[PDB]
Paper text:
The bifunctional enzyme proline utilization A ([name]) catalyzes the two-step oxidation of L-proline to L-glutamate using proline dehydrogenase (PRODH) and L-glutamate-γ-semialdehyde dehydrogenase (GSALDH) domains. The two active sites are 42 Å apart and connected by a buried tunnel that is hypothesized to channel the intermediates Δ1-pyrroline-5-carboxylate (P5C) and/or L-glutamate-γ-semialdehyde (GSAL). The PRODH active site is located in a (βα)8 barrel, while the GSALDH module features Rossmann NAD+-binding and catalytic domains, which are both characteristic of the ALDH superfamily. Kinetic and conventional X-ray crystallography of [name] from [name] (SmPutA) were used to capture high resolution (1.47–1.88 Å) structures of states along the catalytic cycle, including a novel [name]−-proline covalent adduct in the PRODH site, the intermediate P5C bound noncovalently in the reduced PRODH active site, the covalent acyl-enzyme intermediate of the GSALDH reaction, and noncovalent complexes of GSAL and the final product L-glutamate in the GSALDH active site.
Numbering used by the authors: 14 to 78, 83 to 134, 137 to 1229
The structure:
């Protein structure tokens, strides 16, 4: 039985001094990086003057010599230009040239273009919008574009369509690519090869999602090498053409986590392509991609350069990105490698293409700093400093200076001096964009320096997958190509020397002022939790030791009563991935000691309530600091006790830290002397987020002034015990927080105890219903229901239309459905695929499924761990077999035999016919797939809502009309657009749903603390200027009936309601996170008096709800002659169970009436109802007898605004 963590993440090879220096610079502060770059990039005054002169001459040439022309000729608006190009694109998808021309002449030009063209004409409008306008919009206003296309055709007819088609054909066949196939691209290269250029061809493959895709990219590269080599005809690697490849195209799991697979499976494929390039003697360049693939790619480069089968050939090339903080250390490593191997490595120096994405990734991951510079001028200095390094080593490497910036060019041209020969170094540029500049460089009559054109090769479909990334660059306010076209920009500004500008700044190397470090994402509110970089070798080495150490500890969990540990029954705690791995020991709580603990908490409550809220929050902040410091050890316990992967365990500890700091800040913002605690609160938590959810409930209750009885899930008591220990170390007194391990019997004894003033439950809907029933028996000393927060299961869907990008969808589906083996309340359960793209996406999804590694989670390479118990396994596998027994297609990955020592379920895809085939939440790694026709979208949303759950929901579409439609009709608490659906970042995506998924309020949001005090505070930003209009009509009706006091109360409720609140929450770049208050639905009213009914109706209507009024009240005569607007919202119910589901209830009566009604409500089928009760006299005395916070519904929506391939705002 293998030792825990003994193979966690061993590096591919022992790290040399040169490799360790690369790693040390990964996230070095920007003020530390620049000074040595400024020193390295310094040149003489004479050189600087000469370079400015050269740059000035180049830039004057460029300024003194397409779509814009079309737009001008026909006076097109921007939307008209974009729609015309979308139309042209579609028409070109028609292959038969004369067939197309006829469709245009006889059908399109005579209007009704909708009539003739299961896929929006405008799916790529974001890209064409960049071409026409220079600005990137994440989503497509398809109704605007359809109106514009109708308008321009009705105005200008076939001629404008003809010009649109020809324009599109030219840009897509000749400007964005050198050719559609390698043979065509080579034909078109002859002309500029004559003029002294050379070429490197890029076959536009990247991001293989399946083994099939990788093998297809491999054979594309192989066939291109043959065509290029045959065309090269012996010209060699400097004069003749080469090829560029992306390693991500050649393997579907190209990542540090899968390093062993990369070296075993990807390396041989690159070697075979390199052997072919060697035979023809052409270049083969490895392109640079994301920052977390840099160091892994060095391991491939090293093996290849030391492989004797490749000796005698100097065509191997490697890209280095000067916007990266590691660039100079990467170059030292490469130059040394070229010395040891004897290979003259071709080094392409670029600035870097993924800047937007790197900023967002570091912010999302809570890392210490960015792996790239944040000021564009720093990249320019880095570039020039690294060019100086390369030019001093031309004996050993072949520098290739890829840039379109004339200032950069001129600086390097003069840096290189007067001695030149072909083969010493070259410049490089991108096809289409750089020929203007470099035609001022190449040739004996210019600067007589060679330039290699990077030449994309691909069909229209292929080009558009990543044409945005390639444009977005030349289009930002900071880009040279953009600035030289701006007339407001002078030549003097363009020939400005970045080295000298940086040197003379006050602070050399300061971070950009408008980009937040990950720790500062929330500004003064609170400190963001910090993560761990699992691509950093130093981090992996350190984490390996801490994880090993955490596994030698003798973890225990005991009943920790206010007076001290209690004895009880003791059993071991086993690793769910391997029951031979004993993780610890738990002593469970007796039912008598459970009851004892509640009495002890009651007696302690005044002492804890009297601790000022700000000192209570200081305890939470201290606890957050201790967990941050203990994160590596906590990680190791979560991995082995709960079966979680390291990545998921990091995110869990972050969430615990975030809960603690968020509820501390909310407390400091809100709580004062009049917000009295409820009293002892019982917190019952689930196994599957055994630290974060556990901590959030307890931290909220404590900071609100309540002593807590913490009852963790029976499966995961050890991490709960550690969280309690940390909370007590931080200053929470033993009497304020008692730990009671055990099963549901401990939970139920706690709920039933008379001094229990409130319950916070997270778990299954079934168990929540049992707790609701127990509590219907009970009232508070004041005669009011015991507050219950119950956050329960989900049946979460994602809808995907034909505009979505399949590779993005598959990544988000694999993550959402099979991360944590699907053991997240938010996990994706039903994937809904538009019929037109269903087969393609499903094929890709099954391919990606078979790349997942299932096993014990103490290895970094494991993607999917075990399920928590053999009972959970049996329940999940029974579901799979029923489905398989109804004829449903079932796809499963094969499990390795090593899984036999634990409880594993293989990730599973099930193809359903209708959504009605699923009855209950299946809490496991099981994805169901259904298909829909686009016209039935609205019915599909109904089917999703019809399950009665309402937790998470995803939508993948580029089309605004679809977004508006679906998000206005779906009923769920957490929405996600063009991303995964498992985001629950505290204070950013406040988490929690409706219906069968919860009562609210949401955890990690601003209404949560108010449920745990007797008088609710006003949350930050909690108000609305909007007044419900049916409420206003009802207040007027009351005035007409003579109920003047109730009329005024109604108008007051109208004003106090926060319905219509609509906020954007601060978060990472490249995302919009929105928070809104909606109506809950239909509220059950159980009045006793006429005035009580009017107050209840006012509260419900003020918050946007409809109502069902208890007919047994006998108060029908009190609502004669209602305005139709109000009557539409009102119904009367004899049989409550028949008229649901309800979303809440308002009750009037004395204590025995409230208790009776409460039992009746708890017996209603379906969701748990948040009930509010008041006596007639309380309604008279207290205008907040019915609190409006609990009559609205919170909705969180997280939109990935980077999904179109770039970040506009950045
Ligand atoms: C032949 C060839 C081959 C390649 C590439 C280019 C060329 C010409 N690229 C793309 C390259 O990284 C770069 O994005 C473009 O060439 C534009 O940079 P220029 O120097 O031409 O212009 P320019 O001087 O305008 O520099 C713009 C660049 O500055 C950087 N930048 C912008 N804002 C910034 C900020 N706030 N802070 C820091 N830096 C900022 C970015 O790197 C951006 O591309 C690349 N890229 C890649 O990553 N891998 C590869 O393999 C290649 N391959
Ligand atoms: N909505 C959310 O925020 C959220 C988050 C995590 C998990 N969940 C849900 O939790 C479920 C999985 O967790 P679980 O298996 O640990 O849940 P569960 O319902 O099995 O058990 C949850 C807790 O209730 C206790 N319990 C069991 N019976 C009880 C009873 N009769 N009286 C009082 N307490 C009792 C258990 O000891 C445990 O602490 C899933 O349905 C999941 O969707 C929801
Ligand atoms: O594909 C890209 O964006 C960059 C430019 C050429 C190679 N890599
Ligand atoms: O992916 C694309 O379309 C761009 C075009 C040049 C290289 N990459
Ligand atoms: Mg259970």
């Amino acid at each position: 039985a293998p030792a825990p963590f003994a193979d966690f993440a061993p590096p591919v090879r022992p790290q040399s001094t040169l490799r360790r220096a690369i790693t040390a610079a990964y996230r070095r502060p920007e003020t530390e990086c620049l000074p040595p770059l400024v020193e390295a990039a310094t040149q003489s005054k004479e050189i600087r003057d000469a370079a400015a002169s050269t740059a000035r001459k180049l830039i004057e040439a460029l300024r003194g010599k397409g779509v814009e022309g079309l737009v001008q000729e026909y006076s097109l608006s921007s939307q008209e230009g974009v729609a015309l190009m979308c139309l042209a694109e579609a028409l070109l998808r028609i292959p038969d040239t004369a067939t197309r021309d006829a469709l245009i002449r006889d059908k399109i030009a005579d209007g009704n273009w909708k009539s003739h063209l299961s896929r929006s004409l405008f799916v790529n409008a974001a890209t064409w919008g960049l071409v026409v306008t220079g600005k990137l919009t994440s989503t497509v206003n398809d109704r605007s574009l359809a109106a514009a296309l109708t308008r321009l055709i009705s105005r200008c007819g076939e001629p404008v369509i003809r010009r649109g088609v020809d324009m599109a054909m030219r840009m897509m066949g000749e400007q964005f690519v050198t050719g559609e196939t390698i043979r065509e691209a080579l034909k078109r290269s002859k002309e500029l090869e004559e003029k002294g250029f050379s070429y490197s061809y890029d076959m536009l493959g990247e991001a293989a999602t399946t083994a099939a895709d990788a093998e297809r990219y491999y054979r594309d590269y192989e066939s291109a090498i043959h065509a290029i080599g045959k065309a090269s005809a012996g010209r060699g690697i400097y004069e003749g053409p080469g090829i560029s490849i992306k390693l991500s195209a050649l393997h579907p799991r190209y990542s540090r986590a899968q390093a062993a697979r990369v070296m075993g499976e990807l390396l041989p494929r690159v070697k075979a392509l390199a052997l072919l390039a060697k035979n023809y003697d052409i270049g083969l360049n490895i392109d640079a991609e994301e920052a977390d693939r840099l160091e892994l790619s060095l391991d491939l480069l090293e093996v290849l350069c030391l492989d004797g089968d490749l000796s005698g050939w100097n065509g191997m090339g490697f890209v280095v990105q000067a916007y990266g903080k590691r660039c100079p250390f990467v170059l030292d490593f490469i130059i040394d490698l070229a010395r040891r191997s004897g290979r003259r490595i071709m080094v392409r120096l670029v600035k870097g293409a993924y800047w937007d994405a790197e900023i967002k990734r570091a912010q999302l991951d809570g890392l210490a700093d960015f792996p790239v510079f944040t000021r564009k001028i720093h990249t320019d200095v880095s570039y020039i400093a690294c060019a100086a390094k390369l030019l001093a080593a031309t004996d050993v490497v072949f520098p290739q200076f890829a840039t379109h910036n004339a200032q950069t060019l001129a600086a390097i041209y003069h840096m290189a001096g007067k001695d030149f020969h072909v083969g010493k170094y070259e410049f490089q540029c991108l096809h289409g964009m750089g020929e203007p500049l470099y035609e001022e460089v190449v040739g004996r009559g210019k600067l007589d320096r060679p330039c290699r054109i990077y030449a994309p090769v691909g069909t229209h479909e292929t080009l558009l997958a990543y044409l945005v990334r390639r444009l977005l660059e030349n289009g930002a306010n900071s880009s040279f190509v953009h600035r030289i076209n701006d007339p407001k920009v002078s030549i003097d500004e363009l020939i400005a020397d970045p080295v000298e500008v940086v040197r003379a700044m006050p602070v050399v190397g300061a971070k950009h002022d408008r980009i937040a470090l990950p720790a500062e994402l929330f500004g003064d509110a609170r400190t963001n939790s910090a993560g761990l970089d699992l691509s950093n070798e130093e981090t992996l080495a350190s984490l390996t030791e801490a994880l090993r150490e955490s596994a030698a500890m003798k973890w225990t969990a005991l009943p920790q009563l206010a007076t001290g540990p209690a004895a009880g029954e003791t059993r071991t705690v086993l690793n769910p991935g391997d029951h031979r791995d004993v993780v610890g020991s738990v002593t469970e709580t007796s039912e008598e000691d459970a009851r004892r603990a509640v009495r002890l908490a009651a007696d302690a409550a005044p002492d804890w309530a009297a601790v000022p809220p700000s000192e209570r929050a200081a305890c939470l902040d201290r606890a957050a600091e201790l967990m941050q410091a203990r994160m590596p050890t906590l990680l190791g316990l979560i991995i082995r006790e709960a079966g979680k992967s390291a990545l998921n365990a990091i995110a869990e500890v972050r969430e615990a830290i975030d809960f603690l700091r968020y509820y501390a800040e909310q407390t400091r913002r809100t709580l004062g002397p009049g917000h009295g605690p409820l009293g002892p609160i019982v917190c019952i938590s689930p196994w599957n987020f055994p630290l974060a959810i556990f901590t959030g409930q307890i931290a909220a209750a404590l900071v609100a002034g309540n002593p807590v009885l913490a009852k963790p899930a029976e499966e995961t008591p050890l991490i709960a015990a550690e969280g309690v220990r940390i909370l007590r170390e931080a200053g929470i007194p033993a009497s304020a927080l008692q730990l009671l391990p055990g099963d549901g019997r401990v939970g139920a004894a706690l709920v039933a105890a008379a001094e229990t003033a409130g319950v916070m439950f997270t778990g299954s809907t079934e168990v929540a219903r049992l707790i609701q029933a127990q509590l219907a028996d009970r009232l508070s000393p004041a005669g009011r229901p015991i507050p219950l927060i119950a956050e329960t299961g989900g049946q979460n869907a994602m809808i995907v239309d034909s505009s979505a990008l399949a590779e993005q969808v598959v990544g988000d589906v694999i993550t959402s459905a099979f991360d944590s083996a699907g053991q997240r309340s938010s996990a994706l359960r039903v994937l809904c695929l538009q019929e037109d793209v269903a087969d393609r996406i499903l094929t890709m999804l099954k391919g990606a499924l078979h790349e997942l590694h299932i096993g014990r989670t103490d290895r970094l390479s494991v993607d999917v761990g075990p399920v928590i118990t053999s009972e959970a396994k049996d329940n999940i596998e029974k579901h799979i077999e029923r489905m398989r027994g109804l004829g449903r297609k079932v796809e499963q990955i094969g499990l390795a035999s090593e899984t036999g020592v634990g409880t594993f379920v293989p990730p599973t895809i099930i193809e359903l016919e209708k959504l009605s085939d699923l009855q209950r939440e299946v809490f496991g790694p099981v994805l169901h797939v259904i298909r829909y026709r686009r016209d039935d979208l609205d019915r599909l949303v109904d089917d999703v809502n019809a399950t009665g759950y309402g937790l998470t929901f995803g939508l993948h579409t580029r089309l605004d009309e679809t977004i508006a439609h679906v998000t206005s009709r779906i009923k769920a608490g957490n929405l996600y657009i063009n991303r995964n659906i498992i985001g629950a970042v505290v204070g950013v995506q406040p988490f929690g749903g409706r219906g069968l998924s919860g009562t609210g309020p949401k955890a990690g949001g601003p209404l949560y603390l108010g449920r745990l005090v007797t008088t609710a505070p006003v949350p930050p930003q909690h108000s609305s200027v909007h007044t419900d209009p049916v409420l206003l009509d009802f207040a007027k009706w009351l005035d007409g009936k003579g109920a003047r006091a109730e009329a005024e109360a109604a108008r007051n409720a109208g004003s106090s309601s926060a319905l219509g609140l609509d906020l954007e929450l601060p978060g990472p770049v490249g995302e919009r996170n929105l928070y809104t208050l909606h109506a809950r639905g239909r509220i059950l009213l159980v009045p006793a008096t006429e005035s009580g009914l009017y107050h209840q109706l006012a509260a419900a209507l003020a918050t946007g709800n409809s109502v069902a009024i208890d007919a047994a009240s006998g108060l029908q005569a009190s609502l004669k002659n209602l305005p139709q607007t109000v009557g539409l919202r009102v119904s009367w119910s004899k049989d409550w169970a028949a008229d649901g589901p309800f979303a809440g209830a308002l009750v009037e009566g004395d204590a025995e009436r409230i208790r009776a009604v409460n039992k009746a409500i708890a017996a209603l089928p379906g969701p748990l109802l948040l009930v509010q009760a008041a006596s007639s006299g309380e309604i008279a005395r207290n205008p907040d007898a019915y609190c409006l916070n609990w009559l609205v519904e919170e909705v969180s929506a997280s939109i990935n605004t980077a999904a179109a391939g770039g970040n506009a705002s950045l």
